[PDB]
Amino acid sequence: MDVFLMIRRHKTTIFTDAKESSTVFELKRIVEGILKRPPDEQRLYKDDQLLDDGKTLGECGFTSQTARPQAPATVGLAFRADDTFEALCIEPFSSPPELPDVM
Amino acid sequence: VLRSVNSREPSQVIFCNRSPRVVLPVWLNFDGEPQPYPTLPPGTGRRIHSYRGHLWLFRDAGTHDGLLVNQTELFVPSLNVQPIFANITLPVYTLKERCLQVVRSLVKPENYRRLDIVRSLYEDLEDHPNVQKDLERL
Amino acid sequence: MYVKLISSDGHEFIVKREHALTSGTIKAMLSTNEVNFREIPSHVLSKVCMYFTYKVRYTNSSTEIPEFPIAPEIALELLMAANFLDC
Ligand SMILES: O=C1CCSc2ccc(Cl)cc21
Numbered sequence: 564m565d566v567f568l569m570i571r572r573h574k575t576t577i578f579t580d581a582k583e584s585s586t587v588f589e590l591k592r593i594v595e596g597i598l599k600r601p602p603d604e605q606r607l608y609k610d611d612q613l614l615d616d617g618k619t620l621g622e623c624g625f626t627s628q629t630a631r632p633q634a635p636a637t638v639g640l641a642f643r644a645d646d647t648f649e650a651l652c653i654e655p656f657s658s659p660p661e662l663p664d665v666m
Numbered sequence: 667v668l669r670s671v672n673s674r675e676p677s678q679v680i681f682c683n684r685s686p687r688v689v690l691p692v693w694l695n696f697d698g699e700p701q702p703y704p705t706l707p708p709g710t711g712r713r714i715h716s717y718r719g720h721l722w723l724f725r726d727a728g729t730h731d732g733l734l735v736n737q738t739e740l741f742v743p744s745l746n747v748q749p750i751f752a753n754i755t756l757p758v759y760t761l762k763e764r765c766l767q768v769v770r771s772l773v774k775p776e777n778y779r780r781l782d783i784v785r786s787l788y789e790d791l792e793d794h795p796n797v798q799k800d801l802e803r804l
Numbered sequence: 805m806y807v808k809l810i811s812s813d814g815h816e817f818i819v820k821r822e823h824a825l826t827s828g829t830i831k832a833m834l835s836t837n838e839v840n841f842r843e844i845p846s847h848v849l850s851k852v853c854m855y856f857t858y859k860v861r862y863t864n865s866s867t868e869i870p871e872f873p874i875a876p877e878i879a880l881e882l883l884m885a886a887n888f889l890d891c
Pocket residue numbers: 843844845848881882884885888889
């Protein structure tokens with residue numbers, strides 16, 4: 564089954580899909596093709612939990628019923644400077660304005 | 667020009683509502699006039715006595731948003747080789763039309779002109795889905 | 805294969821080029837691989853991208869199509885962007 568994802572770092576968001584059986588490392592290869600950084604320089608998170616390279620997306624809890632096309636699951640991404648990984652962080656999106664009085 | 671054919675040959679059908687909307691079935695009579703039938707709750711089914719060559723379309727009972735039936739917009743009962751299934755589903759609306767549905771559901775039509783958007787959106791919001799409008803067509 | 809859509813507040817959304825060419829307006833602003841949307845903030849543009857994935861996934865599949873969700877708090881800005889992009 565396909566799982567639909569948002570890979571997020573800072574002010575960057577990748578919309579992509581993958582198989583439930585594919586691995587965290589294979590997801591890192593997708594990020595590598597897009598952001599041109601090797602897996603060794605990447606760490607992926609489900610919320611605050613660091614994800615292991617050999618694990619399939621389904622075992623890290625990305626399932627077809629939670630990672631949906633109109634509501635994709637978020638994968639956190641952190642990069643490595645020289646040595647040393649930066650901490651994980653994701654800039655939130657902007658906030659909607661106060662709902663008009665109409666409505 | 668779009669009407670039921672008075673075949674007088676019975677055709678046995680299942681209305682299956684595979685949508686999250688309350689579905690209003692509409693029969694086009696032998697004069698082309700739309701005739702509403704009782705509504706179908708979401709995820710429910712109902713079995714119907716119809717005739718070969720009759721014309722049905724389906725709509726959101728509250729808003730008249732168009733729905734699909736076995737894909738395509740019209741369902742015409744055929745020969746029962748036993749009952750024919752009419753699977754009623756959401757279309758993939760455009761993002762524009764889907765926003766109009768949500769906004770219309772939150773704003774009373776009095777106050778459409780109180781929202782701050784281009785004037786062309788006032789006309790788009792006020793132009794409600796309508797079966798007679800959709801019936802206008804070659 | 806991928807293109808970058810940038811929201812008014814600087815968030816960068818990276819989607820498949822085919823998903824982005826679903827919008828005639830985006831096809832023109834590319835016909836470069838980056839598009840800047842001076843008028844569309846990130847809480848709207850993220851929904852636009854979710855819609856691309858939803859449309860590509862569910863056009864022509866006759867299974868059962870779920871409703872595309874739109875929170876009331878974003879409905880009007882989303883309509884404004886959808887109207888401009890002819891989405
Ligand atoms: O999404 C928005 C939100 C703020 S107002 C606006 C005006 C024009 C266009 Cl294209 C988009 C938008």
